[PDB]
Amino acid sequence: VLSPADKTNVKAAWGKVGAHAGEYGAEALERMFLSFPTTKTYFPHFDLSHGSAQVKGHGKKVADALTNAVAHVDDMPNALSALSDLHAHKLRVDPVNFKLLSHCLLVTLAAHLPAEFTPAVHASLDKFLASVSTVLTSKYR
Amino acid sequence: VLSPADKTNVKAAWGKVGAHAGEYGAEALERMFLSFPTTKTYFPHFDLSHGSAQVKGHGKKVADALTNAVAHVDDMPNALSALSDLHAHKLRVDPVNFKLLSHCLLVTLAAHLPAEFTPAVHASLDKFLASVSTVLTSKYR
Amino acid sequence: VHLTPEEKSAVTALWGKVNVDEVGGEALGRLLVVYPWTQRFFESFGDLSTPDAVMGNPKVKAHGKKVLGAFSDGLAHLDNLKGTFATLSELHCDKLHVDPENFRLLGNVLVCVLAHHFGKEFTPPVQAAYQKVVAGVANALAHKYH
Amino acid sequence: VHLTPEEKSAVTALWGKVNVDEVGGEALGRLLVVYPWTQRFFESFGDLSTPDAVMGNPKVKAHGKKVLGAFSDGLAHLDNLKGTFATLSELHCDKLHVDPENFRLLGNVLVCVLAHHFGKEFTPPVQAAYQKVVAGVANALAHKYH
Ligand code: HEM
Ligand code: HEM
Ligand code: HEM
Ligand code: HEM
């Protein structure tokens, strides 16, 4: 459960990404592929090398999903329901992998927004990404 | 998320425990202490040996909490809110440990209710205990 | 991994009663039903659409027999699980990229199957000894990730 | 664990710039704030009531300096992390009963601190090399559980 301060913290930190949203989503994916190579096997149709147009485009999609969750933080199961169906039913993503992308999103934010990434904001962002991950892994069947 | 069939399956299986509820909760705790000795450190005030009156009494409490969750399966965050506060705020239980007790509860049910513990019911019970665990680990701060 | 002689006795006495043609399919089938992302790795197995379809799928039963044979091998070599599982580690880690958490999950599904099949005989101390076994197998299988 | 020479160069070039009196307290303090069940192990440290209290607690800073010194040792012995961490494994597993998942969490908090402090220099390939390092340290620290 996210507190009022956690919601403020996440909105404020994410607010500072501005036009770089897509770029940071793409960077987090690259960080995940390089650090945790088991995750690459879900993208056989993409080239995962640096500067990939496919990773750049996917990073914009991931960022848009995260902004949806920030904007609808009190109704996240509903906001992310279609995406939760996709990741569990069609893509069969192993739940462990959400922890890995979440960590890489934290690293990316820390590398670009050092004034925002205080210990309290770090904690809020971790809880937020853990909540997104809980929703995205809620539909296995 | 629990489907209608998962809710039916869990109620039906749990229904067959009857007067043995407290006994099976106590057995699951003993199974956890023996199999995963790191969990013992949360109970320095109990003797954890076989036949312990303290483990017997605690097993009744754990079973009562599980019956509350079965009875209020559509409102589990609310039903278990006080218990979630206790485990996270006061007791500081490491979230990993909920997976361990959940597994030991599955083992105990399997050892006593073989006709009930079909693959479909196993899956429903695992999802149910994972949902209980999600609630009980939702209040860290 | 560490089993005492009394745990080893517990473990091998029960294992001698296991039906080795059936228990591995029961555990693999339950893995695919309970943790359904694991189906991603078994697309060629055909019908996995329902629990009955999974449990009655002859490819699940046959593959589960292989899995169980590897556990039997680990039981026979508890003091060198790493060597015993080296090629399977290369396969599951380097080639298949299975997250090693799933090795822990399959071991625990096997424990549940043994509980189901042995009932009161699957006592808490017998379970504790089997948890050491399945932890040691998972850790050995994950060696190529370490 | 497996680092290439180019990863080792990446890792040790950055590490030479780390402030060793501060970064371990920053990581331990962030562990206690982000994963607050870990506070169960630090009752004698006094005021942990707020993020500012944790990060400014001199016992957190001092203890974090010890933690970081162990990471430095692992960096200096990447080919024998097990020996390097043997007594710390006995302490954290046999004596303190810390769940080994928390070793992974602390390593990843350290990665976040390095990202924060090095910014664009903490490139994706530099992170990947540090993930191998913190995975190897966690696995070595958990050896008494295996
Ligand atoms: C923060 C967590 C995550 C978010 C917000 C997220 C978001 C998204 C978005 C928005 C899409 C596009 C959906 C479409 O086009 O409707 C997608 C696709 C997908 N995601 Fe994720 N995702 C997450 C984690 C993961 C993880 C951990 C993996 C696997 C390691 C993964 C694998 C995929 C794949 C394989 C696709 C489809 C790619 C296409 O087939 O081309 N996702 N994700
Ligand atoms: C299915 C999961 C669990 C359920 C339903 C559950 C249930 C309960 C219940 C009902 C109480 C008594 C609450 C009171 O007296 O208000 C309790 C107490 C407590 N639980 Fe759990 N619990 C769960 C998992 C865990 C785990 C995994 C651990 C640690 C390994 C744990 C450690 C404790 C402790 C240490 C107490 C207090 C004991 C007293 O200080 O005497 N619980 N739990
Ligand atoms: C404790 C855990 C496990 C044991 C002991 C085990 C054992 C084995 C065995 C003995 C084989 C046959 C190898 C042969 O044909 O030489 C196999 C094949 C395979 N296993 Fe497992 N396995 C484990 C876990 C898993 C998991 C968790 C998955 C995926 C969710 C998986 C996926 C596969 C696949 C897809 C193959 C077929 C490989 C091929 O023929 O190319 N295994 N496993
Ligand atoms: C990668 C992970 C970690 C490293 C390298 C590490 C390193 C160390 C070091 C170097 C010491 C001092 C030992 C001395 O005084 O000789 C220590 C003490 C201790 N550590 Fe850690 N640690 C790790 C993770 C953790 C975690 C996750 C916890 C608990 C959440 C923890 C709890 C403790 C405690 C409570 C002590 C004090 C023991 C005592 O003085 O009796 N450690 N650790």
mmCIF file of N, CA, C and O in Angstrom, chain B residues 58-133:
data_model
loop_
_atom_site.group_PDB
_atom_site.id
_atom_site.type_symbol
_atom_site.label_atom_id
_atom_site.label_comp_id
_atom_site.label_asym_id
_atom_site.label_seq_id
_atom_site.Cartn_x
_atom_site.Cartn_y
_atom_site.Cartn_z
ATOM 1 N N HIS B 58 -0.881 -21.279 18.918
ATOM 2 C CA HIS B 58 -0.661 -20.350 17.792
ATOM 3 C C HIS B 58 -1.240 -20.869 16.494
ATOM 4 O O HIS B 58 -1.707 -20.098 15.655
ATOM 5 N N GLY B 59 -1.198 -22.201 16.337
ATOM 6 C CA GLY B 59 -1.804 -22.776 15.125
ATOM 7 C C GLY B 59 -3.280 -22.515 15.031
ATOM 8 O O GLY B 59 -3.788 -22.314 13.922
ATOM 9 N N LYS B 60 -3.979 -22.486 16.166
ATOM 10 C CA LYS B 60 -5.388 -22.135 16.134
ATOM 11 C C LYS B 60 -5.560 -20.697 15.687
ATOM 12 O O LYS B 60 -6.469 -20.383 14.902
ATOM 13 N N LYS B 61 -4.675 -19.801 16.116
ATOM 14 C CA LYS B 61 -4.792 -18.391 15.719
ATOM 15 C C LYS B 61 -4.537 -18.266 14.218
ATOM 16 O O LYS B 61 -5.258 -17.536 13.490
ATOM 17 N N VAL B 62 -3.525 -18.955 13.705
ATOM 18 C CA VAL B 62 -3.211 -18.860 12.272
ATOM 19 C C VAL B 62 -4.388 -19.401 11.467
ATOM 20 O O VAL B 62 -4.784 -18.849 10.442
ATOM 21 N N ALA B 63 -4.943 -20.537 11.899
ATOM 22 C CA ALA B 63 -6.090 -21.100 11.197
ATOM 23 C C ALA B 63 -7.255 -20.123 11.235
ATOM 24 O O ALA B 63 -7.921 -19.971 10.210
ATOM 25 N N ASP B 64 -7.523 -19.493 12.362
ATOM 26 C CA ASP B 64 -8.621 -18.535 12.416
ATOM 27 C C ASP B 64 -8.419 -17.384 11.430
ATOM 28 O O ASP B 64 -9.335 -16.890 10.786
ATOM 29 N N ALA B 65 -7.173 -16.944 11.275
ATOM 30 C CA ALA B 65 -6.909 -15.870 10.303
ATOM 31 C C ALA B 65 -7.147 -16.315 8.858
ATOM 32 O O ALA B 65 -7.680 -15.609 8.021
ATOM 33 N N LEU B 66 -6.739 -17.548 8.551
ATOM 34 C CA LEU B 66 -6.995 -18.121 7.246
ATOM 35 C C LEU B 66 -8.501 -18.282 7.000
ATOM 36 O O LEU B 66 -8.950 -17.990 5.882
ATOM 37 N N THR B 67 -9.262 -18.718 8.037
ATOM 38 C CA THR B 67 -10.719 -18.844 7.830
ATOM 39 C C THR B 67 -11.351 -17.480 7.587
ATOM 40 O O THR B 67 -12.295 -17.323 6.792
ATOM 41 N N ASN B 68 -10.852 -16.435 8.250
ATOM 42 C CA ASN B 68 -11.318 -15.079 8.011
ATOM 43 C C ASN B 68 -11.105 -14.670 6.555
ATOM 44 O O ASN B 68 -11.961 -14.092 5.883
ATOM 45 N N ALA B 69 -9.890 -14.972 6.060
ATOM 46 C CA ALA B 69 -9.595 -14.684 4.657
ATOM 47 C C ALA B 69 -10.482 -15.494 3.719
ATOM 48 O O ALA B 69 -10.940 -14.980 2.702
ATOM 49 N N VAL B 70 -10.748 -16.778 3.980
ATOM 50 C CA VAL B 70 -11.675 -17.535 3.129
ATOM 51 C C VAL B 70 -13.064 -16.924 3.147
ATOM 52 O O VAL B 70 -13.742 -16.754 2.130
ATOM 53 N N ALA B 71 -13.555 -16.602 4.339
ATOM 54 C CA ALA B 71 -14.899 -16.059 4.509
ATOM 55 C C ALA B 71 -15.059 -14.686 3.879
ATOM 56 O O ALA B 71 -16.182 -14.296 3.516
ATOM 57 N N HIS B 72 -13.971 -13.945 3.745
ATOM 58 C CA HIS B 72 -14.012 -12.571 3.235
ATOM 59 C C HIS B 72 -13.041 -12.420 2.076
ATOM 60 O O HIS B 72 -12.333 -11.432 1.907
ATOM 61 N N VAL B 73 -13.062 -13.455 1.221
ATOM 62 C CA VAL B 73 -12.105 -13.519 0.126
ATOM 63 C C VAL B 73 -12.181 -12.362 -0.845
ATOM 64 O O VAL B 73 -11.155 -12.050 -1.486
ATOM 65 N N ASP B 74 -13.316 -11.715 -0.981
ATOM 66 C CA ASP B 74 -13.466 -10.570 -1.897
ATOM 67 C C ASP B 74 -13.060 -9.267 -1.242
ATOM 68 O O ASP B 74 -13.061 -8.180 -1.845
ATOM 69 N N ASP B 75 -12.719 -9.287 0.037
ATOM 70 C CA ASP B 75 -12.360 -8.086 0.794
ATOM 71 C C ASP B 75 -11.192 -8.408 1.710
ATOM 72 O O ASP B 75 -11.183 -8.040 2.878
ATOM 73 N N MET B 76 -10.209 -9.123 1.155
ATOM 74 C CA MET B 76 -9.127 -9.562 2.020
ATOM 75 C C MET B 76 -8.236 -8.463 2.570
ATOM 76 O O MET B 76 -7.849 -8.623 3.728
ATOM 77 N N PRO B 77 -7.875 -7.450 1.808
ATOM 78 C CA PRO B 77 -7.096 -6.365 2.421
ATOM 79 C C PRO B 77 -7.755 -5.832 3.679
ATOM 80 O O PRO B 77 -7.081 -5.623 4.703
ATOM 81 N N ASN B 78 -9.068 -5.630 3.637
ATOM 82 C CA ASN B 78 -9.741 -5.126 4.828
ATOM 83 C C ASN B 78 -9.796 -6.134 5.954
ATOM 84 O O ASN B 78 -9.516 -5.870 7.125
ATOM 85 N N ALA B 79 -10.133 -7.383 5.607
ATOM 86 C CA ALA B 79 -10.263 -8.401 6.634
ATOM 87 C C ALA B 79 -8.964 -8.627 7.418
ATOM 88 O O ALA B 79 -8.962 -8.863 8.623
ATOM 89 N N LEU B 80 -7.824 -8.545 6.718
ATOM 90 C CA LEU B 80 -6.531 -8.870 7.325
ATOM 91 C C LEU B 80 -5.734 -7.618 7.670
ATOM 92 O O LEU B 80 -4.547 -7.715 7.977
ATOM 93 N N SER B 81 -6.367 -6.457 7.616
ATOM 94 C CA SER B 81 -5.605 -5.220 7.830
ATOM 95 C C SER B 81 -4.895 -5.189 9.170
ATOM 96 O O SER B 81 -3.718 -4.794 9.260
ATOM 97 N N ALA B 82 -5.537 -5.548 10.272
ATOM 98 C CA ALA B 82 -4.863 -5.506 11.564
ATOM 99 C C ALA B 82 -3.687 -6.484 11.594
ATOM 100 O O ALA B 82 -2.630 -6.216 12.144
ATOM 101 N N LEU B 83 -3.910 -7.661 11.031
ATOM 102 C CA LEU B 83 -2.830 -8.639 11.009
ATOM 103 C C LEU B 83 -1.669 -8.192 10.136
ATOM 104 O O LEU B 83 -0.496 -8.494 10.422
ATOM 105 N N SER B 84 -1.969 -7.478 9.066
ATOM 106 C CA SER B 84 -0.933 -6.927 8.175
ATOM 107 C C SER B 84 -0.109 -5.872 8.896
ATOM 108 O O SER B 84 1.125 -5.818 8.814
ATOM 109 N N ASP B 85 -0.775 -5.006 9.647
ATOM 110 C CA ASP B 85 -0.063 -4.051 10.502
ATOM 111 C C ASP B 85 0.820 -4.770 11.494
ATOM 112 O O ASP B 85 1.976 -4.368 11.669
ATOM 113 N N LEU B 86 0.306 -5.826 12.125
ATOM 114 C CA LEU B 86 1.102 -6.510 13.140
ATOM 115 C C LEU B 86 2.380 -7.102 12.524
ATOM 116 O O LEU B 86 3.498 -6.955 13.034
ATOM 117 N N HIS B 87 2.224 -7.822 11.402
ATOM 118 C CA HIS B 87 3.379 -8.572 10.871
ATOM 119 C C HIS B 87 4.423 -7.622 10.323
ATOM 120 O O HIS B 87 5.620 -7.882 10.449
ATOM 121 N N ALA B 88 3.996 -6.518 9.728
ATOM 122 C CA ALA B 88 5.005 -5.618 9.151
ATOM 123 C C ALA B 88 5.560 -4.623 10.157
ATOM 124 O O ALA B 88 6.779 -4.465 10.329
ATOM 125 N N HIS B 89 4.683 -3.948 10.887
ATOM 126 C CA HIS B 89 5.133 -2.853 11.747
ATOM 127 C C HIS B 89 5.759 -3.304 13.050
ATOM 128 O O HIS B 89 6.826 -2.824 13.392
ATOM 129 N N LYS B 90 5.071 -4.204 13.757
ATOM 130 C CA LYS B 90 5.564 -4.649 15.059
ATOM 131 C C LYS B 90 6.552 -5.795 14.916
ATOM 132 O O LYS B 90 7.644 -5.797 15.502
ATOM 133 N N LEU B 91 6.192 -6.778 14.130
ATOM 134 C CA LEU B 91 7.014 -7.979 14.108
ATOM 135 C C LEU B 91 8.130 -7.921 13.070
ATOM 136 O O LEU B 91 9.093 -8.700 13.230
ATOM 137 N N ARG B 92 8.043 -7.053 12.066
ATOM 138 C CA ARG B 92 9.061 -6.905 11.049
ATOM 139 C C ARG B 92 9.331 -8.243 10.363
ATOM 140 O O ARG B 92 10.461 -8.601 10.090
ATOM 141 N N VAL B 93 8.277 -9.003 10.080
ATOM 142 C CA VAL B 93 8.533 -10.264 9.379
ATOM 143 C C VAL B 93 9.006 -10.042 7.960
ATOM 144 O O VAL B 93 8.436 -9.319 7.124
ATOM 145 N N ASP B 94 10.145 -10.668 7.653
ATOM 146 C CA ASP B 94 10.677 -10.642 6.296
ATOM 147 C C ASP B 94 9.700 -11.227 5.293
ATOM 148 O O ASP B 94 9.210 -12.351 5.527
ATOM 149 N N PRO B 95 9.390 -10.519 4.238
ATOM 150 C CA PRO B 95 8.395 -11.014 3.268
ATOM 151 C C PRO B 95 8.700 -12.408 2.711
ATOM 152 O O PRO B 95 7.747 -13.137 2.365
ATOM 153 N N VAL B 96 9.971 -12.783 2.636
ATOM 154 C CA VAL B 96 10.279 -14.130 2.121
ATOM 155 C C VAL B 96 9.577 -15.227 2.921
ATOM 156 O O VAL B 96 9.205 -16.317 2.424
ATOM 157 N N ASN B 97 9.417 -14.931 4.214
ATOM 158 C CA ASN B 97 8.920 -15.997 5.096
ATOM 159 C C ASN B 97 7.482 -16.375 4.820
ATOM 160 O O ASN B 97 7.074 -17.489 5.152
ATOM 161 N N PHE B 98 6.699 -15.466 4.225
ATOM 162 C CA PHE B 98 5.309 -15.829 3.914
ATOM 163 C C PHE B 98 5.260 -16.935 2.856
ATOM 164 O O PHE B 98 4.351 -17.775 2.949
ATOM 165 N N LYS B 99 6.203 -16.959 1.929
ATOM 166 C CA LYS B 99 6.264 -18.034 0.961
ATOM 167 C C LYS B 99 6.535 -19.374 1.640
ATOM 168 O O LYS B 99 6.044 -20.428 1.223
ATOM 169 N N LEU B 100 7.340 -19.312 2.700
ATOM 170 C CA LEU B 100 7.704 -20.559 3.402
ATOM 171 C C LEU B 100 6.534 -21.102 4.174
ATOM 172 O O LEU B 100 6.234 -22.311 4.129
ATOM 173 N N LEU B 101 5.829 -20.274 4.936
ATOM 174 C CA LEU B 101 4.641 -20.780 5.649
ATOM 175 C C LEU B 101 3.575 -21.208 4.658
ATOM 176 O O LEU B 101 2.906 -22.218 4.885
ATOM 177 N N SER B 102 3.399 -20.472 3.564
ATOM 178 C CA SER B 102 2.391 -20.868 2.583
ATOM 179 C C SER B 102 2.687 -22.262 2.047
ATOM 180 O O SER B 102 1.773 -23.078 1.942
ATOM 181 N N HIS B 103 3.952 -22.524 1.710
ATOM 182 C CA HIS B 103 4.298 -23.866 1.242
ATOM 183 C C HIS B 103 3.989 -24.927 2.310
ATOM 184 O O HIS B 103 3.449 -25.997 2.031
ATOM 185 N N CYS B 104 4.324 -24.613 3.555
ATOM 186 C CA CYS B 104 4.051 -25.610 4.605
ATOM 187 C C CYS B 104 2.560 -25.826 4.866
ATOM 188 O O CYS B 104 2.198 -26.945 5.243
ATOM 189 N N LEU B 105 1.748 -24.802 4.674
ATOM 190 C CA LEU B 105 0.298 -25.006 4.766
ATOM 191 C C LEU B 105 -0.170 -25.919 3.619
ATOM 192 O O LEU B 105 -0.995 -26.815 3.845
ATOM 193 N N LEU B 106 0.344 -25.722 2.393
ATOM 194 C CA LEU B 106 -0.003 -26.617 1.277
ATOM 195 C C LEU B 106 0.387 -28.054 1.586
ATOM 196 O O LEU B 106 -0.382 -28.991 1.359
ATOM 197 N N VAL B 107 1.603 -28.232 2.132
ATOM 198 C CA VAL B 107 2.052 -29.589 2.465
ATOM 199 C C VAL B 107 1.138 -30.225 3.485
ATOM 200 O O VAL B 107 0.789 -31.417 3.383
ATOM 201 N N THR B 108 0.772 -29.476 4.508
ATOM 202 C CA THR B 108 -0.095 -30.025 5.549
ATOM 203 C C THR B 108 -1.443 -30.431 4.988
ATOM 204 O O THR B 108 -1.986 -31.512 5.281
ATOM 205 N N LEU B 109 -2.047 -29.591 4.126
ATOM 206 C CA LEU B 109 -3.346 -29.918 3.534
ATOM 207 C C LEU B 109 -3.201 -31.151 2.664
ATOM 208 O O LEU B 109 -4.044 -32.052 2.661
ATOM 209 N N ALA B 110 -2.105 -31.230 1.891
ATOM 210 C CA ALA B 110 -1.897 -32.389 1.033
ATOM 211 C C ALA B 110 -1.772 -33.665 1.863
ATOM 212 O O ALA B 110 -2.261 -34.712 1.424
ATOM 213 N N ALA B 111 -1.099 -33.594 3.002
ATOM 214 C CA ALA B 111 -0.866 -34.775 3.848
ATOM 215 C C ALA B 111 -2.120 -35.272 4.547
ATOM 216 O O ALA B 111 -2.143 -36.445 4.981
ATOM 217 N N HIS B 112 -3.109 -34.406 4.693
ATOM 218 C CA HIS B 112 -4.346 -34.808 5.372
ATOM 219 C C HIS B 112 -5.561 -34.947 4.479
ATOM 220 O O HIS B 112 -6.511 -35.641 4.859
ATOM 221 N N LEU B 113 -5.572 -34.299 3.332
ATOM 222 C CA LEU B 113 -6.802 -34.247 2.544
ATOM 223 C C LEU B 113 -6.487 -34.625 1.126
ATOM 224 O O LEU B 113 -6.629 -33.801 0.205
ATOM 225 N N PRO B 114 -6.015 -35.855 0.938
ATOM 226 C CA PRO B 114 -5.566 -36.221 -0.402
ATOM 227 C C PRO B 114 -6.680 -36.132 -1.438
ATOM 228 O O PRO B 114 -6.391 -35.714 -2.546
ATOM 229 N N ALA B 115 -7.933 -36.488 -1.157
ATOM 230 C CA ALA B 115 -8.973 -36.358 -2.191
ATOM 231 C C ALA B 115 -9.232 -34.911 -2.575
ATOM 232 O O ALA B 115 -9.650 -34.562 -3.695
ATOM 233 N N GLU B 116 -9.017 -33.982 -1.674
ATOM 234 C CA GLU B 116 -9.268 -32.580 -1.970
ATOM 235 C C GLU B 116 -8.126 -31.945 -2.772
ATOM 236 O O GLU B 116 -8.350 -30.987 -3.528
ATOM 237 N N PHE B 117 -6.913 -32.440 -2.630
ATOM 238 C CA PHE B 117 -5.694 -31.794 -3.111
ATOM 239 C C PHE B 117 -5.373 -32.199 -4.539
ATOM 240 O O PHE B 117 -4.282 -32.698 -4.869
ATOM 241 N N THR B 118 -6.339 -31.990 -5.427
ATOM 242 C CA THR B 118 -6.174 -32.202 -6.858
ATOM 243 C C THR B 118 -5.277 -31.127 -7.465
ATOM 244 O O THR B 118 -5.031 -30.122 -6.814
ATOM 245 N N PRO B 119 -4.755 -31.271 -8.680
ATOM 246 C CA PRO B 119 -3.942 -30.187 -9.275
ATOM 247 C C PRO B 119 -4.680 -28.853 -9.355
ATOM 248 O O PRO B 119 -4.099 -27.793 -9.041
ATOM 249 N N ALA B 120 -5.970 -28.849 -9.737
ATOM 250 C CA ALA B 120 -6.724 -27.573 -9.801
ATOM 251 C C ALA B 120 -6.873 -26.931 -8.428
ATOM 252 O O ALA B 120 -6.715 -25.705 -8.288
ATOM 253 N N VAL B 121 -7.143 -27.752 -7.411
ATOM 254 C CA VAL B 121 -7.316 -27.214 -6.050
ATOM 255 C C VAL B 121 -5.984 -26.749 -5.482
ATOM 256 O O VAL B 121 -5.923 -25.699 -4.832
ATOM 257 N N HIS B 122 -4.927 -27.500 -5.757
ATOM 258 C CA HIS B 122 -3.567 -27.061 -5.402
ATOM 259 C C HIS B 122 -3.332 -25.663 -5.953
ATOM 260 O O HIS B 122 -2.828 -24.772 -5.272
ATOM 261 N N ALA B 123 -3.654 -25.464 -7.234
ATOM 262 C CA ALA B 123 -3.396 -24.159 -7.822
ATOM 263 C C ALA B 123 -4.221 -23.093 -7.128
ATOM 264 O O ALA B 123 -3.678 -21.999 -6.868
ATOM 265 N N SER B 124 -5.492 -23.400 -6.859
ATOM 266 C CA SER B 124 -6.337 -22.399 -6.183
ATOM 267 C C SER B 124 -5.842 -22.040 -4.795
ATOM 268 O O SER B 124 -5.828 -20.867 -4.430
ATOM 269 N N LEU B 125 -5.427 -23.059 -4.037
ATOM 270 C CA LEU B 125 -4.881 -22.852 -2.713
ATOM 271 C C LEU B 125 -3.584 -22.069 -2.739
ATOM 272 O O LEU B 125 -3.386 -21.200 -1.905
ATOM 273 N N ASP B 126 -2.708 -22.370 -3.717
ATOM 274 C CA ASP B 126 -1.496 -21.560 -3.841
ATOM 275 C C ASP B 126 -1.844 -20.111 -4.118
ATOM 276 O O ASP B 126 -1.245 -19.207 -3.520
ATOM 277 N N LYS B 127 -2.767 -19.864 -5.035
ATOM 278 C CA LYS B 127 -3.126 -18.453 -5.319
ATOM 279 C C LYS B 127 -3.733 -17.776 -4.096
ATOM 280 O O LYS B 127 -3.467 -16.598 -3.827
ATOM 281 N N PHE B 128 -4.576 -18.513 -3.384
ATOM 282 C CA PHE B 128 -5.188 -17.967 -2.170
ATOM 283 C C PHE B 128 -4.106 -17.611 -1.165
ATOM 284 O O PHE B 128 -4.148 -16.501 -0.593
ATOM 285 N N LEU B 129 -3.163 -18.509 -0.901
ATOM 286 C CA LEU B 129 -2.147 -18.188 0.107
ATOM 287 C C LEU B 129 -1.199 -17.093 -0.360
ATOM 288 O O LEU B 129 -0.720 -16.299 0.453
ATOM 289 N N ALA B 130 -0.938 -17.018 -1.663
ATOM 290 C CA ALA B 130 -0.164 -15.910 -2.185
ATOM 291 C C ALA B 130 -0.924 -14.593 -2.015
ATOM 292 O O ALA B 130 -0.281 -13.592 -1.741
ATOM 293 N N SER B 131 -2.258 -14.600 -2.185
ATOM 294 C CA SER B 131 -3.013 -13.380 -1.925
ATOM 295 C C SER B 131 -3.024 -12.959 -0.458
ATOM 296 O O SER B 131 -2.908 -11.766 -0.105
ATOM 297 N N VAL B 132 -3.170 -13.940 0.443
ATOM 298 C CA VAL B 132 -3.061 -13.649 1.886
ATOM 299 C C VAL B 132 -1.699 -13.026 2.162
ATOM 300 O O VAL B 132 -1.532 -12.020 2.867
ATOM 301 N N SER B 133 -0.649 -13.633 1.583
ATOM 302 C CA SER B 133 0.705 -13.154 1.806
ATOM 303 C C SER B 133 0.939 -11.743 1.267
ATOM 304 O O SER B 133 1.629 -10.960 1.912
#
